[PDB]
Design an enzyme around this catalytic site. Structure first.
Site, PDB file in Angstrom:
ATOM      1  N   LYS A   5      11.608  -8.909   4.297  1.00  0.00           N
ATOM      2  CA  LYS A   5      11.330  -7.082   3.449  1.00  0.00           C
ATOM      3  C   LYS A   5      11.480  -6.291   5.290  1.00  0.00           C
ATOM      4  CE  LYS A   5       7.623  -5.584   0.887  1.00  0.00           C
ATOM      5  NZ  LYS A   5       6.652  -5.561  -0.452  1.00  0.00           N
ATOM      6  N   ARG A  14      14.847  -5.548   5.859  1.00  0.00           N
ATOM      7  CA  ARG A  14      15.302  -5.308   5.765  1.00  0.00           C
ATOM      8  C   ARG A  14      14.931  -3.392   5.242  1.00  0.00           C
ATOM      9  NH1 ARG A  14      13.930  -2.798   0.429  1.00  0.00           N
ATOM     10  NH2 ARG A  14      12.036  -4.758  -0.256  1.00  0.00           N
ATOM     11  N   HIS A  32      12.641  -2.498   8.044  1.00  0.00           N
ATOM     12  CA  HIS A  32      12.739  -1.723   8.846  1.00  0.00           C
ATOM     13  C   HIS A  32      13.714  -1.433  10.737  1.00  0.00           C
ATOM     14  CE1 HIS A  32       8.476  -0.480   7.460  1.00  0.00           C
ATOM     15  NE2 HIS A  32       8.247  -1.464   7.381  1.00  0.00           N
ATOM     16  N   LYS A  34       9.527   6.259  -1.574  1.00  0.00           N
ATOM     17  CA  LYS A  34       8.534   5.767  -0.162  1.00  0.00           C
ATOM     18  C   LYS A  34       8.331   6.941   0.504  1.00  0.00           C
ATOM     19  CE  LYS A  34       7.341   2.556   3.049  1.00  0.00           C
ATOM     20  NZ  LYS A  34       7.771   1.426   3.765  1.00  0.00           N
ATOM     21  N   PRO A  35       7.153   7.335   0.253  1.00  0.00           N
ATOM     22  CA  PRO A  35       6.418   8.394   1.429  1.00  0.00           C
ATOM     23  C   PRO A  35       7.134   8.628   2.955  1.00  0.00           C
ATOM     24  CG  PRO A  35       4.905   7.732   0.567  1.00  0.00           C
ATOM     25  CD  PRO A  35       5.632   7.033  -0.408  1.00  0.00           C
ATOM     26  N   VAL A  36       6.779   7.476   3.170  1.00  0.00           N
ATOM     27  CA  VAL A  36       6.861   7.366   5.214  1.00  0.00           C
ATOM     28  C   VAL A  36       8.055   6.652   4.833  1.00  0.00           C
ATOM     29  CG1 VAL A  36       5.732   9.322   6.173  1.00  0.00           C
ATOM     30  CG2 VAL A  36       4.938   6.925   5.772  1.00  0.00           C
ATOM     31  N   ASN A  37       9.179   5.660   6.460  1.00  0.00           N
ATOM     32  CA  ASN A  37       8.906   4.858   7.146  1.00  0.00           C
ATOM     33  C   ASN A  37       9.344   4.717   8.004  1.00  0.00           C
ATOM     34  OD1 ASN A  37       9.980   2.043   6.001  1.00  0.00           O
ATOM     35  ND2 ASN A  37      11.341   2.237   6.679  1.00  0.00           N
ATOM     36  N   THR A  38       9.807   4.159   8.789  1.00  0.00           N
ATOM     37  CA  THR A  38      10.331   3.533  10.389  1.00  0.00           C
ATOM     38  C   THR A  38      11.231   3.128  10.666  1.00  0.00           C
ATOM     39  OG1 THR A  38       8.201   4.539  11.110  1.00  0.00           O
ATOM     40  CG2 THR A  38       9.480   4.268  12.542  1.00  0.00           C
ATOM     41  N   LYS A  56      -4.153  -1.079  11.710  1.00  0.00           N
ATOM     42  CA  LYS A  56      -4.839  -0.513  10.774  1.00  0.00           C
ATOM     43  C   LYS A  56      -5.978  -0.732  10.160  1.00  0.00           C
ATOM     44  CE  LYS A  56      -1.491   3.408  12.008  1.00  0.00           C
ATOM     45  NZ  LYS A  56      -0.199   4.617  11.639  1.00  0.00           N
ATOM     46  N   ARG A  81      10.218  11.201   7.017  1.00  0.00           N
ATOM     47  CA  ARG A  81       9.404  11.922   6.020  1.00  0.00           C
ATOM     48  C   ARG A  81       9.086  12.372   5.018  1.00  0.00           C
ATOM     49  NH1 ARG A  81       6.774  12.508   9.822  1.00  0.00           N
ATOM     50  NH2 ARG A  81       5.321  11.313   9.519  1.00  0.00           N
ATOM     51  N   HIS A 107       5.121  -6.507   8.895  1.00  0.00           N
ATOM     52  CA  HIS A 107       4.559  -5.279   8.733  1.00  0.00           C
ATOM     53  C   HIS A 107       4.628  -4.362  10.075  1.00  0.00           C
ATOM     54  CE1 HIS A 107       2.209  -1.834   7.661  1.00  0.00           C
ATOM     55  NE2 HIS A 107       1.254  -2.291   8.527  1.00  0.00           N
ATOM     56  N   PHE A 108       5.296  -3.254   9.784  1.00  0.00           N
ATOM     57  CA  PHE A 108       5.461  -2.422  10.657  1.00  0.00           C
ATOM     58  C   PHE A 108       3.922  -1.126  10.672  1.00  0.00           C
ATOM     59  CE2 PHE A 108       6.300   1.769  12.646  1.00  0.00           C
ATOM     60  CZ  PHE A 108       7.254   1.463  14.039  1.00  0.00           C
ATOM     61  N   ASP A 109       3.240  -1.348  12.022  1.00  0.00           N
ATOM     62  CA  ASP A 109       1.744  -0.668  11.440  1.00  0.00           C
ATOM     63  C   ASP A 109       1.539   1.028  12.192  1.00  0.00           C
ATOM     64  OD1 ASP A 109      -0.602  -1.745  10.187  1.00  0.00           O
ATOM     65  OD2 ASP A 109      -1.466  -1.353  12.306  1.00  0.00           O
TER      66      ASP A 109
END
Length: 121
Positions: A7, A10, A12, A38-42, A63, A82, A116-118
């Site tokens: 996941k 996929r 990030h 999705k609000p934001v992603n990197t 975080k 964004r 997870h991308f923090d």
């Protein structure tokens, strides 16, 4: 069912691929606008090996307060996505922003890999 590690890849990883249309295309092709915008992603434009190596780099607090987060020693080429104001589902509109920053990811499992991308600092 894809693994937590799958996941992360996929959501990030994009070692291959930019334009101002990048996020609009990627957010959809990676299924991040399936049931909601999705609000934001990197996205990280480094090899999988380089990102996976971050799990053995600088240990920092996540975080959420957990301790399994790691910051990259070197800056990495990333793309921040964004959501715009006039977005509105199902036509999710995104603002594409390229940058070179250190990344922070949470790692877990055996093998110990990013799940997870923090953040990007």
């Amino acid at each position: 069912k894809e693994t937590a590690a799958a996941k992360f890849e996929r959501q990030h990883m994009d070692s291959s691929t930019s334009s101002s249309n990048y996020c609009n295309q990627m957010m959809k092709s990676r299924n991040l606008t399936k049931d909601r915008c999705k609000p934001v992603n990197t996205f990280v434009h480094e090899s999988l090996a380089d990102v996976q190596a971050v799990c053995s780099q600088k240990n920092v607090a996540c975080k959420n307060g957990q301790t399994n987060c790691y910051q990259s020693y070197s800056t990495m080429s990333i793309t921040d996505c964004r959501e715009t104001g006039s977005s509105k589902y199902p036509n999710c509109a995104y603002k594409t922003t390229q940058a070179n920053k250190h990344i922070i990811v949470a790692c877990e499992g055996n093998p110990y890999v990013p799940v997870h991308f923090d953040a990007s600092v």
